[PDB]
Design an enzyme around this catalytic site. Structure first.
Site, PDB file in Angstrom:
ATOM      1  N   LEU A 113       0.816  -1.215   0.000  1.00 47.59           N
ATOM      2  CA  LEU A 113       0.000   0.000   0.000  1.00 47.59           C
ATOM      3  C   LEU A 113       0.851   1.268   0.000  1.00 47.59           C
ATOM      4  O   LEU A 113       0.669   2.133  -0.856  1.00 47.59           O
ATOM      5  CB  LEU A 113      -0.975   0.017   1.179  1.00 47.59           C
ATOM      6  CG  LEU A 113      -2.263  -0.794   0.994  1.00 47.59           C
ATOM      7  CD1 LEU A 113      -3.001  -0.977   2.323  1.00 47.59           C
ATOM      8  CD2 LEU A 113      -3.172  -0.139  -0.037  1.00 47.59           C
ATOM      9  N   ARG A 147       6.307  -8.739 -10.231  1.00 46.81           N
ATOM     10  CA  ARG A 147       7.397  -9.680 -10.527  1.00 46.81           C
ATOM     11  C   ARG A 147       6.989 -11.112 -10.201  1.00 46.81           C
ATOM     12  O   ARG A 147       6.829 -11.483  -9.027  1.00 46.81           O
ATOM     13  CB  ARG A 147       8.715  -9.321  -9.809  1.00 46.81           C
ATOM     14  CG  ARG A 147       9.858 -10.275 -10.249  1.00 46.81           C
ATOM     15  CD  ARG A 147      11.253  -9.751  -9.919  1.00 46.81           C
ATOM     16  NE  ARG A 147      11.489  -9.588  -8.487  1.00 46.81           N
ATOM     17  CZ  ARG A 147      12.668  -9.273  -7.942  1.00 46.81           C
ATOM     18  NH1 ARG A 147      13.741  -9.068  -8.702  1.00 46.81           N
ATOM     19  NH2 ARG A 147      12.780  -9.151  -6.626  1.00 46.81           N
ATOM     20  N   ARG A 201      -5.316   1.652   6.415  1.00 49.25           N
ATOM     21  CA  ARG A 201      -4.841   2.542   5.366  1.00 49.25           C
ATOM     22  C   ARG A 201      -5.227   2.010   3.989  1.00 49.25           C
ATOM     23  O   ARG A 201      -5.318   0.798   3.779  1.00 49.25           O
ATOM     24  CB  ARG A 201      -3.329   2.743   5.454  1.00 49.25           C
ATOM     25  CG  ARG A 201      -2.518   1.554   4.995  1.00 49.25           C
ATOM     26  CD  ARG A 201      -1.079   1.952   4.681  1.00 49.25           C
ATOM     27  NE  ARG A 201      -0.312   2.312   5.875  1.00 49.25           N
ATOM     28  CZ  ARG A 201      -0.149   3.554   6.323  1.00 49.25           C
ATOM     29  NH1 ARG A 201      -0.704   4.575   5.679  1.00 49.25           N
ATOM     30  NH2 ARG A 201       0.569   3.777   7.416  1.00 49.25           N
ATOM     31  N   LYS A 226      15.908  -6.119   6.921  1.00 46.50           N
ATOM     32  CA  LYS A 226      17.078  -5.281   7.133  1.00 46.50           C
ATOM     33  C   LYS A 226      17.999  -5.995   8.117  1.00 46.50           C
ATOM     34  O   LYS A 226      17.597  -6.299   9.242  1.00 46.50           O
ATOM     35  CB  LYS A 226      16.682  -3.902   7.685  1.00 46.50           C
ATOM     36  CG  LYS A 226      15.748  -3.115   6.782  1.00 46.50           C
ATOM     37  CD  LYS A 226      15.497  -1.720   7.335  1.00 46.50           C
ATOM     38  CE  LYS A 226      14.512  -0.949   6.470  1.00 46.50           C
ATOM     39  NZ  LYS A 226      14.224   0.398   7.053  1.00 46.50           N
ATOM     40  N   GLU A 258      20.143 -10.633 -15.392  1.00 46.60           N
ATOM     41  CA  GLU A 258      20.699 -10.961 -14.078  1.00 46.60           C
ATOM     42  C   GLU A 258      21.269 -12.365 -14.066  1.00 46.60           C
ATOM     43  O   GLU A 258      21.482 -12.940 -13.002  1.00 46.60           O
ATOM     44  CB  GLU A 258      19.663 -10.796 -12.956  1.00 46.60           C
ATOM     45  CG  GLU A 258      18.463 -11.751 -13.031  1.00 46.60           C
ATOM     46  CD  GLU A 258      17.397 -11.410 -12.001  1.00 46.60           C
ATOM     47  OE1 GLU A 258      16.266 -11.956 -12.067  1.00 46.60           O
ATOM     48  OE2 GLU A 258      17.696 -10.592 -11.110  1.00 46.60           O
ATOM     49  N   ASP A 275      17.594  -9.877   0.503  1.00 43.11           N
ATOM     50  CA  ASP A 275      16.616 -10.790  -0.082  1.00 43.11           C
ATOM     51  C   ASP A 275      17.358 -11.962  -0.742  1.00 43.11           C
ATOM     52  O   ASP A 275      18.580 -12.073  -0.592  1.00 43.11           O
ATOM     53  CB  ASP A 275      15.565 -10.055  -0.964  1.00 43.11           C
ATOM     54  CG  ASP A 275      15.984  -9.852  -2.426  1.00 43.11           C
ATOM     55  OD1 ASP A 275      17.174 -10.012  -2.792  1.00 43.11           O
ATOM     56  OD2 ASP A 275      15.066  -9.492  -3.226  1.00 43.11           O
ATOM     57  N   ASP A 323      21.740 -10.778  -8.293  1.00 41.40           N
ATOM     58  CA  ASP A 323      21.597 -12.105  -8.878  1.00 41.40           C
ATOM     59  C   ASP A 323      22.729 -12.354  -9.877  1.00 41.40           C
ATOM     60  O   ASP A 323      23.293 -13.447  -9.938  1.00 41.40           O
ATOM     61  CB  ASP A 323      20.255 -12.254  -9.591  1.00 41.40           C
ATOM     62  CG  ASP A 323      19.238 -13.015  -8.771  1.00 41.40           C
ATOM     63  OD1 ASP A 323      18.069 -12.623  -8.791  1.00 41.40           O
ATOM     64  OD2 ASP A 323      19.585 -14.024  -8.134  1.00 41.40           O
TER      65      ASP A 323
HETATM   66  C1  040 Z   1      14.142  -6.207  -4.324  1.00 37.24           C
HETATM   67  C2  040 Z   1      15.479  -6.317  -3.684  1.00 37.24           C
HETATM   68  C3  040 Z   1      15.669  -5.775  -2.403  1.00 37.24           C
HETATM   69  C4  040 Z   1      16.908  -5.867  -1.762  1.00 37.24           C
HETATM   70  C5  040 Z   1      17.993  -6.507  -2.384  1.00 37.24           C
HETATM   71  C6  040 Z   1      17.818  -7.051  -3.650  1.00 37.24           C
HETATM   72  C7  040 Z   1      16.567  -6.974  -4.298  1.00 37.24           C
HETATM   73  C8  040 Z   1      16.504  -7.587  -5.633  1.00 37.24           C
HETATM   74  O1  040 Z   1      15.484  -8.485  -5.882  1.00 37.24           O
HETATM   75  C9  040 Z   1      17.433  -7.367  -6.576  1.00 37.24           C
HETATM   76  C10 040 Z   1      17.502  -8.068  -7.855  1.00 37.24           C
HETATM   77  O2  040 Z   1      16.578  -8.696  -8.367  1.00 37.24           O
HETATM   78  C11 040 Z   1      18.881  -8.243  -8.419  1.00 37.24           C
HETATM   79  O3  040 Z   1      19.864  -7.552  -8.159  1.00 37.24           O
HETATM   80  O4  040 Z   1      19.212  -9.548  -8.644  1.00 37.24           O
HETATM   81 MG    MG Z   2      17.259 -10.659  -8.970  1.00 33.50          MG
END
Ligand code: 040
Ligand code: MG
Ligand code: MG
Ligand code: MG
EC number: 2.3.3.9
Length: 709
Positions: A124, A326, A299, A605, A418, A617, A446
């Site tokens: 949101l 995605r 919200r 984080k 990537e 991630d 990636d």
């Molecule tokens: C959304 C996010 C948040 C934090 C760190 C990375 C990512 C990615 O998901 C990055 C990505 O596709 C790429 O570099 O492979």
């Molecule tokens: Mg990626």
């Protein structure tokens, strides 16, 4: 069982119901037809999906064997990659023909925000981040240093606030300069004969370029706000002398609002954890609520913004970020649907069907308005390897469009560059999607993971931080821009660059991320609405359209450069440097994985070894795990080093985390999360292309199983 039979498929009940009762109504799609189409598409496309995955394994085997049998001939290597079909012929020059795309994508350069779709509150806020407060973004972050007298306290600090005002005054001077004088000296704003007039102490002045005046609110002779435009991006000066900040301002300026997150990617992939039908439904439901306009977390989504034109008429600007979704890539299956053998169905295929169906709602009136007015559905497709895999995505989308009764090419593709086999065949990859592509983006995290795994057998790699600036990656960045511009992306599709992961280092971001639009990228990724607002500043300072024009015809990366493996030199590290690298990776790995496995949180984080807060991630996990795997494979470190570090960092992570949190130490082996982290490193070399999903998904499902009994 709790499944629903449709042809050869056995669909989890929760998913079946959600689709029927929540997603299908209002699409005007016959439900029986939808489900028949699901079964048919899955039946027809699964063999090729499998064949493509098998091809990745076959190519990696040959490359692994290539390094193993040698004791660094670029000529010979390049010929080998050609022989095995890894490096394919480059097609002749062409221009993309993608149509039905919104201006936010074809024309506007600006920030692109990515957020986990399973978090409704974040999703949101992200959709609403099309507009954001510059004052809040400056005051609330380190862009204004917390020097003496300017520190943040429980209440408003005027020394700090005055520095915010001055920073923004300088931004206006730089972006929409006055014919004479400075916004810093302004005492008021009025609209006279359709022209913005800025009162100064001893005179009044207009804009050097009156065309930058886009509109206003309130009375022309005493406006409540003034709207400007620069490089296609809007800036709104809010005027209110009776406000907390306004009363301190020479012209009664309350705030400066920047059009910020022009587009937003709602993520089903690397920033979410979803391992079964229940998780997928939570995500699908949020994506549905966004497209129907009724997501409420209470919200809600914002309405469009009303303005008065310079001449006196009326117009509106969009209140929301234009949304991409995605999908997951070609790798994973998910047991949300299984077939009669008990085999899981490919998740990428499922996402195309379900996220495409749901996206139809965003093409029509929200009872509460229209995501894409031009009639497109924007799907980012990640982790593709080479042009055949892109062609397969295009055929998947073609078949889904048929099931959904959408015109061909409705479902557009944001191509992540990537993976190395896409990088070195980028032109061909773009050509394979020439009628569907709406962006290419350098997913550099990636890409780094893939770089390490591809040449795993070659030797030990440079440290993680070092990777960020290796020849291969700088060439990869320029190559991507070159390919997109040559394919006619300027004015047709986005050329995008990657994520800023240091969520609290905004001064650094503002200083450094400007390189991205300077490189001709028309968008790049930010982690938060606040970072979107700050990154917007860069697009006011750099004219991306002009930069792209200037780069036309230039070729600034060679194949040899793209293929330069980031091997470390002899005796590169002292013991303490090695220990730092190990601890740093183990900390980040553990911090991310424990929340993934125990709480189903796909993005977190996590402070690094220098206490820098990083948004983690699966991509960043892919790098850390693959790097440690590589160092273990080549004897830089021992399994005891790895064990020691994981055990060292585990309590610090427990400390950093509570409520649903279950500590890892001291009983490490009772923690599925801890064992997951260990597995990711120790089995890293054996994961297909170093992907982290197989382990995370297995371990998350294991944890759910135990918590349930
Ligand atoms: C959304 C996010 C948040 C934090 C760190 C990375 C990512 C990615 O998901 C990055 C990505 O596709 C790429 O570099 O492979
Ligand atoms: Mg990626
Ligand atoms: Mg092997
Ligand atoms: Mg300019």
């Amino acid at each position: 069982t709790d499944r629903v039979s449709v042809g050869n498929l056995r669909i989890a009940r929760v998913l079946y119901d959600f689709v029927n009762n929540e997603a299908l109504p209002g699409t005007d799609i016959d439900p029986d037809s939808f489900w028949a189409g699901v079964d048919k598409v899955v039946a027809d496309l699964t063999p090729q999906n499998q064949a493509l995955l098998n091809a990745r394994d076959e190519l990696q085997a040959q490359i692994d064997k290539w390094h193993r049998r040698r004791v660094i001939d670029m000529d010979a290597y390049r010929q080998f990659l050609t022989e095995i079909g890894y490096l394919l012929p480059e097609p002749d020059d062409f221009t993309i023909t993608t149509s039905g795309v919104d201006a936010e994508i074809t024309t506007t350069a600006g920030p692109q925000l990515v957020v986990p779709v399973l978090n409704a509150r974040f999703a949101l806020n992200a959709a609403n981040a099309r507009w954001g407060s510059l004052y809040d973004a400056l005051y609330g972050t380190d862009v204004i240093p917390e020097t003496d007298g300017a520190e943040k306290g429980p209440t408003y600090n005027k020394v700090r606030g005055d520095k915010v005002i001055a920073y923004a005054r300088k931004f206006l001077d730089d972006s929409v300069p006055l014919s004479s004088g400075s916004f810093g000296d302004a005492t008021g704003f009025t609209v006279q004969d359709g022209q913005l007039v800025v009162a100064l102490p001893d005179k009044s002045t207009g804009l050097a370029n009156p065309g930058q005046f886009a509109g206003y609110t309130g009375a022309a002779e005493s406006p409540t706000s003034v709207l400007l435009i620069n490089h296609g991006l809007h800036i709104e000066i809010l005027i209110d002398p009776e406000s907390q900040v306004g009363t301190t301002d020479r012209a009664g300026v309350k705030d400066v609002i920047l059009e910020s997150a022009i587009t937003t990617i709602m993520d089903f992939e690397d920033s979410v954890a979803a391992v079964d039908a229940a998780d997928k439904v939570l995500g699908y439901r949020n994506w549905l609520g966004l497209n129907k306009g009724d997501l409420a977390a209470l919200r809600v989504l914002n309405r469009d913004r009303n303005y008065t034109a310079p001449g006196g008429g009326q117009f509106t600007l969009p209140g929301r970020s234009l949304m991409f979704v995605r999908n997951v890539g070609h790798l994973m299956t998910n047991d949300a649907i299984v077939d009669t053998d008990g085999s899981e169905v490919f998740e990428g295929i499922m996402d195309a069907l379900f996220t495409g169906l749901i996206a139809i709602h965003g093409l029509k009136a929200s009872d509460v308005l229209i995501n894409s007015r031009t009639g497109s559905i924007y799907i980012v497709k990640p982790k593709m390897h080479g042009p055949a895999e892109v062609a397969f995505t295009c055929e998947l989308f073609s078949r889904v469009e048929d099931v959904l009764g959408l015109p061909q090419n409705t479902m557009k593709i944001g191509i992540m560059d990537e993976e190395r086999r896409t990088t070195v065949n980028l032109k061909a990859c773009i050509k394979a999607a020439a009628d569907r592509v709406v962006f290419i983006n350098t997913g550099f995290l990636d890409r780094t993971g893939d770089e390490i795994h591809t040449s795993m057998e070659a030797g030990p790699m440079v440290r993680k931080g070092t990777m960020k600036s290796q020849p291969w990656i700088l060439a990869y960045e320029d190559h991507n821009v070159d390919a997109g511009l040559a394919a006619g992306f300027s004015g047709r599709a986005q050329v995008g660059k990657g994520m800023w992961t240091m969520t609290e280092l905004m001064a650094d971001m503002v200083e450094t991320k400007i390189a991205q639009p300077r490189a001709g990228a028309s968008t790049a990724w930010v982690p938060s609405p606040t970072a979107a607002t700050l990154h917007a500043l860069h697009y006011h300072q750099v004219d991306v359209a002009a930069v792209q024009q200037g780069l036309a015809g230039k070729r600034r990366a060679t194949i040899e450069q793209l293929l330069t493996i980031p091997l470390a030199k002899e005796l590169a590290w002292a013991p303490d440097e090695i220990r730092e690298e190990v601890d740093n990776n183990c900390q980040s790995i553990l911090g991310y994985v424990v929340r993934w496995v125990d709480q189903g949180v796909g993005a977190s984080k996590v402070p690094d070894i220098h206490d820098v807060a990083l948004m983690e991630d699966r991509a960043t996990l892919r790098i850390s795990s693959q790097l440690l795997a590589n160092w273990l494979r080549h004897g830089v470190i021992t399994s005891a080093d790895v064990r020691a570090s994981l055990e060292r960092m585990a309590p610090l992570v427990d400390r950093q985390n509570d409520v649903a949190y279950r500590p890892m130490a001291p009983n490490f082996d009772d923690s599925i999360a801890f064992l997951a982290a260990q597995e990711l490193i120790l089995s890293g070399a054996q994961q297909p292309n170093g992907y982290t999903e197989p382990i995370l998904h297995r371990r998350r499902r294991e944890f759910k199983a135990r918590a349930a009994e």
